[PDB]
Each structure stands twice: as C-alpha cells, then as structure tokens.
Swiss-Prot record, chain A:
This is Small ribosomal subunit protein bS6. The keyword Cytoplasm does not apply. The lineage of its organism: Bacteria, Thermotogati, Deinococcota, Deinococci, Thermales. GO terms for cellular component: cytoplasm; ribonucleoprotein complex; ribosome. It comes from Thermus thermophilus (strain ATCC 27634 / DSM 579 / HB8). The keyword Protein transport does not apply. One of its GO terms (molecular function) is small ribosomal subunit rRNA binding. Belongs to the bacterial ribosomal protein bS6 family. Part of the 30S ribosomal subunit. Forms a tight heterodimer with protein bS18. May make transient contacts with protein uL2 of the 50S subunit during translation.
UniProtKB/Swiss-Prot annotation, chain B:
GO terms for cellular component: ribonucleoprotein complex; ribosome. This is Small ribosomal subunit protein uS11. The gene is rpsK. Located on the upper part of the platform of the 30S subunit, where it bridges several disparate RNA helices of the 16S rRNA. Forms part of the Shine-Dalgarno cleft in the 70S ribosome, where it interacts both with the Shine-Dalgarno helix and mRNA. The keyword Ribonucleoprotein applies. Keywords: Ribonucleoprotein, Ribosomal protein, RNA-binding, rRNA-binding. One of its GO terms (molecular function) is rRNA binding. The keyword RNA-binding applies.
From Swiss-Prot, chain C:
GO terms for biological process: translation. Keywords: Ribonucleoprotein, Ribosomal protein, RNA-binding, rRNA-binding. Belongs to the bacterial ribosomal protein bS18 family. It comes from Thermus thermophilus (strain ATCC 27634 / DSM 579 / HB8). The chain holds residues 19 to 88 of 88 of the full protein. This is Small ribosomal subunit protein bS18. It comes from the Bacteria.
Curated annotation (Swiss-Prot), chain D:
The gene is rpsO. Belongs to the universal ribosomal protein uS15 family. One of the primary rRNA binding proteins, it binds directly to 16S rRNA where it helps nucleate assembly of the platform of the 30S subunit by binding and bridging several RNA helices of the 16S rRNA. Forms an intersubunit bridge (bridge B4) with the 23S rRNA of the 50S subunit in the ribosome. It comes from Thermus thermophilus (strain ATCC 27634 / DSM 579 / HB8). GO terms for biological process: translation. Disulfide bonds: none annotated. One of its GO terms (cellular component) is cytosolic small ribosomal subunit. Keywords: Ribonucleoprotein, Ribosomal protein, RNA-binding, rRNA-binding. GO terms for molecular function: rRNA binding; structural constituent of ribosome. SUPFAM superfamilies: S15/NS1 RNA-binding domain. PROSITE patterns: RIBOSOMAL_S15. It comes from the Bacteria. Part of the 30S ribosomal subunit. Forms a bridge to the 50S subunit in the 70S ribosome, contacting the 23S rRNA. This is Small ribosomal subunit protein uS15.
RNA sequence: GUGGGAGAGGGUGGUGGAAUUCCCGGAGUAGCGGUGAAAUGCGCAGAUACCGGGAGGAACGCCGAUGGCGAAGGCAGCCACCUGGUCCACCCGUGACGCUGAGGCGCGAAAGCGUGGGGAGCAAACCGGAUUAGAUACCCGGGUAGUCCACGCCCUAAACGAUGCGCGCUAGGUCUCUGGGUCUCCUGGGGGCCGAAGCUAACGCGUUAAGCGCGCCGCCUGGGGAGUACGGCCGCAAGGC
C-alpha cells in the first residue's frame, strides 16, 4: 500500500445525473481495487491549454489515495474504459519540495 | 461574388518559392497567389521581389471580393518572407495581427540527407 | 531582466496542478524557459521540468503557442 | 521490494546474539534473501541484463562469506547452510 | 545495520503532443517541386497553399548543460510497476572475511543471417533527370532490402581517455554536479580547466598522473609479405578467434 494521487479529467458537457454516474462508477472502481480515499479535490470546469476531445475545456477531479501497488496499473485501465473520461493520470505521492523558501 | 471583408492571410515561404493565400475568417481560401502565378519560373520565384508581387496580386484579388481587414499567419523561413509581410501591409489591406506559425516537429521523422 | 523565481513566494515546485504559477516559467511560445531566465538551481530546474510536462499532459499547460508581432 | 520489517524479521532470525546486525551469518542470510528475490525477477525479464550483473556480484559476495565461515567455524557453516538451503 | 539522497542504469506495461505521409470532406485555381542554373517528377481524374476529420508508423522539441547514470556497449516525452549500481551521515554489528585474475561463463554499437510480424519517414542495390571531355561519383526525382517489434544467431569497431584493475603517498587555484555540516567557508563523492614537485623524445601529464611506490592480469620486439596461407575451434551463412 502506497500513497497516490489519481487525476481524472472528464467531459465538461455532462449534466448532473451523468456526472454523478461517472463519479459513482469511479468510486466503485476504487473500492474494487482496494483504494482507500484519504482526501478529494474536485475543481470542476477549467479551460484547457489545448483542446482535448474537441472540447476547449474539461472537468477536473483529484483523489489522494492509499492502495496496493500491484493493483495500481490495473486500476488505471479500468478508469479509461469510460468514454466520458478523457484523461486519467495516476501519480505516486511526493513531499512538497520548496523553492524561493 | 462573396463580400468577405475580414479574414486570414497566410504566407507560406520556402527557399524555393513563396505562396500567399487569402481566406475567410473560418479558414476557407478565397484567393491565392505565388511566385509562379506572376510570370517567374525558376530560381527567380524565390526572390523577395516575387514575394512582393505575389502578396500584391493576392491583395488585388482580395479587393475584388471586397476585403478590408487581414490577420496574417506567417509560416516558414525564406527570402522575402518579410518582404511579403511588408508588401501586404502597404497593399491597401489594413492588417490586424501578424503571427509566426512555422511548424516544428518534436522530432518525429528522419530528414533527407540534405537536411541532417 | 529579472528572473522568474525572483518574483514569487514560497511555492511548490512539485505542484503540477498549479497553473497560476507554472505559466510564468514558459515563453511567448509554449517552451520551458532556460535557467538564464528562470533563475532556478540545477535541481530546481530539473524538477520544474517534470512538473511542467505533467501539467501539459493534463491539458493545464500548453505544449506550444504561436508568436505575435513578427 | 524488501521493506524494513521484512528485512528485520530475517536479521532477528539469523542474529547470533541480541543486536547483531553484522555477523557472517546475518550477512549471508540477507544476501540470500536479495538473491532469491532477484532470481525471481529474472525468471520474468530474462532480457534485463544490467540486473543480472548485480546477481553475479551478490552471488560472489555470498560465496566469499561462506568460504570464510567454513574456513573459521565449520559447524556454523553447516548450520547456516542447513537453515538457508544453499549448496 | 540504521537513516538520508541524486540519477536518459535496466526490464515490462500504459499514455501524450508536435511533425511527415496517406485517406475522407469543404473551400479554392495553374501551377507546384527542385537547382548554381535546370530537368526528370507531380498537377484539369483539380495538385501546391488553407480549414475540419480519420488511419498508421517512427522519433521525443523547449528543459538540455561546458550536465547526469552505467562495468563496457550504451541510456533523453510522461506514468505505474519490477529491479541493478552508487554517495553521504551516525561509528552501531562481523573481525582480514582482502586485491588481482590464465581458462571458463555472461554482456557486447552498427551492419548482417533465420522465422514471423510491421512499414509512416529515410534509404545500400536499382530506375531515371541535369552537370560536365565522360559516369557507374558528388546535385535532382523515384525506389527495394534495411531501418521498427518478437524470438534465435552473429562477437566486429577510431568498442577511444587510442591511457588494465586495486591501494598508499606527493602544492595550490578555478568552474561545476551531488551529499553532510556550527553554510564567508569547511568536509565527502563525481565531472572539467589551469598549474607545485616530478615525469616526458617532444607534444604534453600533473590528488580524475602520463609523478613516487607495491600487487596481479593482458600485450610488444624493424618495414613489407599479412591479419594473408596452412591447421584447429566457433558460425545456418557472411565470416570470426
Ligand atoms: Mg523555385
Ligand atoms: Mg532511465
Ligand atoms: Mg526504462
Ligand atoms: Mg482536398
Ligand atoms: Mg509544365
Ligand atoms: Mg501533365
Ligand atoms: Mg489531420
Ligand atoms: Mg497503412
Ligand atoms: Mg540542445
Ligand atoms: Mg555527457
Ligand atoms: Mg561512444
Ligand atoms: Mg533504486
Ligand atoms: Mg565500533
Ligand atoms: Mg569484538
Ligand atoms: Mg576481479
Ligand atoms: Mg590469454
Ligand atoms: Mg576472463
Ligand atoms: Mg553486437
Ligand atoms: Mg541491428
Ligand atoms: Mg544477404
Ligand atoms: Mg531479420
Ligand atoms: Mg536519392
Ligand atoms: Mg564532373
Ligand atoms: Mg549525366
Ligand atoms: Mg546517377
Ligand atoms: Mg525520397
Ligand atoms: Mg602498467
Ligand atoms: Mg579540481
Ligand atoms: Mg560540496
Ligand atoms: Mg549544503
Ligand atoms: Mg573536486
Ligand atoms: Mg617543471
Ligand atoms: Mg617515469
Ligand atoms: Mg620540457
Ligand atoms: Mg596539464
Ligand atoms: Mg594512480
Ligand atoms: Mg608515458
Ligand atoms: Mg621482418
Ligand atoms: Mg613482420
Ligand atoms: Mg579477419
Ligand atoms: Mg582456416
Ligand atoms: Mg560446421
Ligand atoms: Mg570481413
């Protein structure tokens, strides 16, 4: 079990039923791969610096987790199956290196 | 037979030749011109003068469609790139913005022996 | 010329999600600025590169831009 | 990999007396642990050579420690071998 | 052992953007391309230039260094996993357990071979264009193997620092990467440049020795003949020792 950050960028044009559904599916996927959720940041709609999936903007969520290492890659695969999820980036957690400090 | 009046002017400049394309604001070309469009044939098509005359021909053909404003998009490097921007500015078309778009790879493809 | 780091507070060089800061390390174009501009140390720079590239992958930062004037 | 308590369990197991982190017995034990791990990782990744060099080196070290133990106390050697499953 | 650290070190899987090519669509005419100049070539079955969409392969711009890692070959997008080496601090444990290393065994750029995939760009061979006394060559248009992946061979090289490995000893100055410290600086480990003593035929080397020493391995003995012949071993072959 290590400490990770799961980034998910999904389609901004979803309504509430839809978004809630993709989100719940994601929850289920984490629970299935044994990922405990330490904290969550959902920043939502933001303007991408380049268009992704013909959309100028995207919807952002961030999940800090602790999960089994061996499963992590697999977890990623699952999250990508959904069409509505444009980006998935899983990152091993790091301490906040500081500069001009 | 259009009445466009605002749009894009693309200047594609290589060492061999210079070509200009005047287009509508959503990207579809209206008129175009090049070194060879005006009488030049060989190496002579790469001179800055050719670029001048090509910009000017293109701007004429623009006036015929009733063009006024132009956003310039510059691609490539060759002689008379700047001469084409120049001629285009003093053409009677009033330019809005000039932009260098020259495409560069992130290193995809092997070049020909001449280019390595 | 005053370096990018010179105007900034204590800031995470590891935060790929923070655009408001990271933008200042890129040129007119999309390019990651040289140390001569960013004022960073070797290690600092080396981290900032990774962070930027991560953010780029996430669409939060541009891979390339276009040059005005000219 | 090999984590702290995974390793400690082995050190405790093979230590001669309390607080012995350094004895020939312990060094050999640890080396063996690493070796076996590496051998498992080389059953897959048969194409990873740079690690295989490491394997050769660790194997060498172990053989040196063993030849030394066997030279000094033969009984401790036989014991160590019986426990570990070497040779 | 504990506790820290930097890293294009390696293997597997996944993913991102720029560009080239091709296919689809719109818009749009008379050329484009290319050279010292040209021509072959491509374009009215609508090219080039411009916009949108799609497919596919290969390689990762800026960061990037005069930088880093590796035993060497060599290693550069990002992510995860599996894994090698190494540096520092603490002075904690073992108690000479060390160095080197004929043979052996393994790794070994590129090209090359075998079987099967893949194939965008480049491109030996080849097919053409022009230059020029001429052409098989330098320039131009095409183009197959190959370059890419899997597995199995091949074992070469300016495989270069043209400098075997290890340890101790012998002024400094300066730039730098990476640790620790009471951080003007000091101390440890790399990478460079000048230079003490000294060495060197000279050029140069000089705490990253080509100095002063010790241990062990490899190698040399005028040029050609010749890395040829014969023989042996290895290899499917090419061919290697
Ligand atoms: Mg021309
Ligand atoms: Mg690496
Ligand atoms: Mg790798
Ligand atoms: Mg078309
Ligand atoms: Mg013609
Ligand atoms: Mg024709
Ligand atoms: Mg396209
Ligand atoms: Mg195809
Ligand atoms: Mg560079
Ligand atoms: Mg280097
Ligand atoms: Mg080399
Ligand atoms: Mg490691
Ligand atoms: Mg002690
Ligand atoms: Mg004692
Ligand atoms: Mg040895
Ligand atoms: Mg011999
Ligand atoms: Mg040998
Ligand atoms: Mg080889
Ligand atoms: Mg090869
Ligand atoms: Mg052949
Ligand atoms: Mg083959
Ligand atoms: Mg050719
Ligand atoms: Mg001639
Ligand atoms: Mg001829
Ligand atoms: Mg020819
Ligand atoms: Mg070609
Ligand atoms: Mg010697
Ligand atoms: Mg120095
Ligand atoms: Mg220091
Ligand atoms: Mg310090
Ligand atoms: Mg030094
Ligand atoms: Mg002297
Ligand atoms: Mg001497
Ligand atoms: Mg002298
Ligand atoms: Mg010197
Ligand atoms: Mg020495
Ligand atoms: Mg000498
Ligand atoms: Mg002789
Ligand atoms: Mg002789
Ligand atoms: Mg030979
Ligand atoms: Mg023979
Ligand atoms: Mg035979
Ligand atoms: Mg030969």
């Amino acid at each position: 079990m290590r400490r990770y950050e799961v980034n998910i960028v999904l389609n901004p044009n979803l309504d509430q039923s839809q978004l809630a559904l993709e989100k719940e599916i994601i929850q289920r996927a984490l629970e299935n791969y044994g990922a405990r959720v330490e904290k969550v940041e959902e920043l939502g709609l933001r303007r991408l610096a380049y268009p992704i999936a013909k959309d100028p903007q995207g919807y952002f969520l961030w999940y800090q987790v602790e999960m089994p290492e061996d499963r992590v890659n697999d977890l990623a695969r699952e999250l990508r199956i959904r069409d509505n999820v444009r980006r998935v980036m899983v990152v091993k957690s790091q301490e906040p290196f500081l500069a001009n400090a | 037979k259009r009445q466009v009046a605002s749009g894009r002017a693309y200047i594609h400049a290589s060492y061999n030749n210079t070509i200009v394309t005047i287009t509508d604001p959503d990207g579809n070309p209206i008129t175009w011109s090049s070194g060879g469009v005006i009488g030049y044939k060989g190496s002579r098509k790469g001179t800055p003068y050719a670029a001048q005359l090509a910009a000017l021909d293109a701007a004429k053909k623009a006036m015929a469609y009733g063009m006024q404003s132009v956003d310039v998009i510059v691609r490539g490097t060759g002689a008379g790139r700047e001469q084409a921007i120049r001629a285009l500015q003093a053409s009677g078309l009033q330019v809005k913005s000039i932009v260098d778009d020259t495409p560069v790879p992130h290193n995809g493809c092997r070049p020909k022996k001449k280019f390595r | 010329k005053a370096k990018v780091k010179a105007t900034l507070g204590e800031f995470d060089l590891r935060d790929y999600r923070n655009v408001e800061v990271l933008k200042r390390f890129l040129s007119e174009t999309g390019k990651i600025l040289p140390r001569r501009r960013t004022g960073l140390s070797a290690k600092e720079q080396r981290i900032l590169a990774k962070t930027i590239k991560r953010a780029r992958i996430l669409g939060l930062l541009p891979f390339t831009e276009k040059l005005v004037r000219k | 990999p090999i984590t702290k308590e995974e390793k400690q369990k082995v050190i405790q197991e093979f230590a001669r007396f309390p607080g012995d982190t350094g004895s020939t017995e312990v060094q050999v034990a640890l080396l063996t642990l690493r070796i076996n791990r590496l051998s498992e990782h080389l059953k897959v990744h048969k194409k990873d050579h740079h690690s295989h060099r490491g394997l050769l080196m660790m194997v060498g070290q172990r053989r040196r420690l063993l030849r030394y133990l066997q030279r000094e106390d033969p009984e401790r050697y036989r014991a160590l071998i019986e426990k570990l499953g070497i040779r």
